[PDB]
From a paper:
Rad53, and its mammalian ortholog the checkpoint kinase 2 (Chk2), are key effector kinases of the DNA replication checkpoint. Rad53 contains two forkhead-associated (FHA) domains, as well as two SQ/TQ cluster domains (SCD), flanking its kinase domain. We generated chimeras expressing the HBRCT (Dbf4) and FHA1 (Rad53) domains in tandem and solved the crystal structures of these chimeras in the absence and presence of a phosphorylated epitope derived from Cdc7.
The chimera containing a five-residue linker readily yielded diffraction-quality crystals. The C-terminal end of Dbf4 (residues 216–220) and the N-terminal end of Rad53 (residues 22–29), as well as the five amino acid linker, were disordered in the structure. The distance between the last ordered residue of the HBRCT domain of Dbf4 and the first ordered residue in the closest FHA1 neighbors, the crystal packing contacts and the behavior in solution of the chimeras, confirms that the Dbf4:Rad53 complex forms inter-molecularly. In good agreement with our previous results showing that the pThr-binding pocket of the FHA1 domain does not mediate the interaction with Dbf416, the complex forms through the lateral surface of the FHA1 domain defined by the β2-β1-β11-β10-β7-β8 strands and the concave surface of the HBRCT domain. Globally the two interfaces bury a mere 10% of the total accessible surface area of the FHA1 (755 out of 6,664 Å2) and the HBRCT (801 out of 7,799 Å2) domains, a value that is below the cutoff for specific interactions as judged using the PISA server.
Residue numbers in the entry: 103 to 136, 139, 141 to 216, 238 to 363
The structure:
């Protein structure tokens, strides 16, 4: 519920704090894991991301520390001994972040031609673009010029992720004559366009800001793409 302007202000402030006076400590204790070396790799990735922000990493636990980042469960810190630095950190009202939260934080601080710009507004997928060779496109005589496939399969032109009720080949975006994009559902569980379920194996014309929604029926697998069609493409086609 943060507006674009609010979230931008939120970001500006944190970058400011990170650069000037954040002091991050990485908890060296773990819960036994059944090869520590994998989380040592994800750890050093986090450290470099924070260094990218101009923040200072500490080798020892001070009270000058502003954030501690840990692999151990934050939920169970109250069960640790009083000497444990996670226990001491929380009781002194210090920030205690999970590796996931830290990676999530760093992501939020930014650490052929374009047919359209696909934007997943539910989060899961980064901003991707659809590409097509223009000279090759006008060369084609067939009615359908190019064909992007969306689906559960990471072999598709657009990977929708490993979702429960999706399909290896879920739906398609077809490029037609005269620079028009259209939509084609081939899934078995369904595709939606602006809240309306589209007819399977039937080409529906896409418009500006049209919202493709799949995985309807489970609020976790849900996925909404908004298509922002490039005007220059048709304006030169």
């Amino acid at each position: 519920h943060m507006t674009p302007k609010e979230l931008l202000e939120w970001q500006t402030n944190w970058k400011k704090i990170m650069k000037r006076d954040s002091r991050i400590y990485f908890d060296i204790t773990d819960d036994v894991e059944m090869y520590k070396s994998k989380m040592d790799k994800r750890r050093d990735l986090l450290k470099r991301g924070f260094l990218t922000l101009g923040a200072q990493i500490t080798q020892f636990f001070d009270t000058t520390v502003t954030i501690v980042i840990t692999r151990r469960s934050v939920e169970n810190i109250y069960l640790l001994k009083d000497t444990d630095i996670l226990s001491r950190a929380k009781k002194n009202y210090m920030k205690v972040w999970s590796y996931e939260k830290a990676a999530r934080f760093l992501k939020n601080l930014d650490v052929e031609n374009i047919v359209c710009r696909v934007i997943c507004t539910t989060g899961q997928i980064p901003i991707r673009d659809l590409s097509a060779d223009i000279s090759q496109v006008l060369k084609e005589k067939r009615s359908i010029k190019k064909v992007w496939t969306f689906g559960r399969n990471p072999a598709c032109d657009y990977h929708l992720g490993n979702i429960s009720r999706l399909s290896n080949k879920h739906f398609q975006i077809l490029l037609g004559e005269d620079g028009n994009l259209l939509l084609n559902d081939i899934s078995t569980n369904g595709t939606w366009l602006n809240g309306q379920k589209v007819e399977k194996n039937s080409n529906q014309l896409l418009s500006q800001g049209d919202e493709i929604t799949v995985g309807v029926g489970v609020e976790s697998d849900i996925l909404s793409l908004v298509i922002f069609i490039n005007d220059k493409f048709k304006q030169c086609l």
